Ligand binder design. Sequence first.
Ligand SMILES: [Zn+2]
Lengths: 50, 10, 308, 49, 181
Amino acid sequence: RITTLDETVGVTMSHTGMSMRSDNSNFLKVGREKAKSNIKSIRMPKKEIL
Amino acid sequence: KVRPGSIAAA
Amino acid sequence: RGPNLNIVLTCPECKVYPPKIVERFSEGDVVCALCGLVLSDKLVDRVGEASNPLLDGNNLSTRIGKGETTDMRFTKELNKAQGKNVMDKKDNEVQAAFAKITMLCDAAELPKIVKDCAKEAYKLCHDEKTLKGKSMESIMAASILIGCRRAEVARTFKEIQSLIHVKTKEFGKTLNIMKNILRGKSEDGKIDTDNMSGAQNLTYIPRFCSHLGLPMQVTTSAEYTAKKCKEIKEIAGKSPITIAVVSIYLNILLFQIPITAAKVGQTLQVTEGTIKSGYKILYEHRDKLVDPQLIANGVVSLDNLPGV
Amino acid sequence: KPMVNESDGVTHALYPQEARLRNLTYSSGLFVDVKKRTYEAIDVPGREL
Amino acid sequence: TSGIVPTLQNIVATVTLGCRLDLKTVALHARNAEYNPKRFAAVIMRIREPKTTALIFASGKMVVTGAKSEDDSKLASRKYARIIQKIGFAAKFTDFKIQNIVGSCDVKFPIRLEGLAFSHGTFSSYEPELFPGLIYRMVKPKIVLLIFVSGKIVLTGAKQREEIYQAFEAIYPVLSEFRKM
Ligand SMILES: [Zn+2]
């Protein structure tokens, strides 16, 4: 049979909707994975890059 | 012409 | 700057201006109250559609859908043709923003008034020069926060961030811009009350206590403690979240509820060190942070509060 | 068990009498355990992964 | 009326030289230099006697900061220009303008930030969940003030020593009106 939670309803719902706690999961963090890497460069003189 | 015979010139 | 086109009902015989007029709805008449002369008779009291001219303004449109007999080709082609409209494109952006706001509020389990106010704020603050370089996520989050505050159900920055992925700097800048826009339109064209204040730590306590599962008596005691906590200068400068959390923890240990600070801070996303530090400051004024009626009735005394 | 969340965000157990009087829906919440897995493989050309 | 004159903590000044500089040469031949193109597009240098920091760009523009007085800032800018001249690049003192003045003071009593935010809602912006200090945008003079519960006031935005004093004198009464207890 299905399992019924006997805990307080507010305690059970504390994880739902706009909750203070921030998610610590790392699943499907494509944005983080590709945004962490970033490198830039300077304008070296044209006479060499040419 | 900015640097007269100075360390910058070298 | 236009024709009058106004009708005023007055009794020719009485000549009294303004006149005493009675609208006999049951008899469908408008009668002078003094002489009884009838001024207008045959007064009037699904075929149409309703709209709110506060979130959509004046925009009449109709959808295309299947009927009792229909071919999919015609529906597809007609929807394709209707999509390629230039005049309707401008308002479709506002409609899409409304849809995303509705999705966010519904996922947040917020009341209908909150999302309606958020949509109104977004519409009022949209299409302005000041908000042109800010992300739509920041705009929507700021509007949702403003609506939540206006509905007396104000949420917190972290709580809204849990759903909308926007950093604090952008969120605060957008919120300030939106508040300035609302103030400007309130003056030129109300909007704010005591609720518009920032701290309003009293509103948070019931929800945090609900998250912790404490009884309503403990919730009321925590509300009283937080209300009186603003008298201490060493704590009034702290964040309202910290003030409310520390008051709740103080009342929890007052009533000896088996919930440790390690779990209180984990549930409310507040550092345990911060909680205990705030408890240290409030312990020096515990006497002014407990309800006189409670301590007199004897549900608990000052004794049940361990101090380091 | 049957529960109701108020506008301010406080959730409490709901009874049929209160539901009838307050025009609230007598309903309970449903929760499911979710497992999020992620696999990866080296995609050498012309071979099964 | 207040009897206390706020003290100027910081001075941001801008100077121009009108000549192009070689950041590599400046970094190699300067005592205190930090040339990191990945970090920034200018050379950061500092001097001790005025205790000031200068950002020098390849376009001949210099930004001096840290001076505690207008004449001290002038002296620091002159010394920076002399250092560049000694390096050899043609650098001549030109328009020197102070673009920002920062000052601090204390009223010596707590202030009801909520009361100020409610009464003066057209100029104040109090969001204690981000910053523990109210922000007051005084319109005349155009300056920004940071008001804290501890009774400390920070003034920023003035271009001259007169504007900051005027702003403090104009804000003292409204601050005194909202003293806690
Ligand atoms: Zn009449």
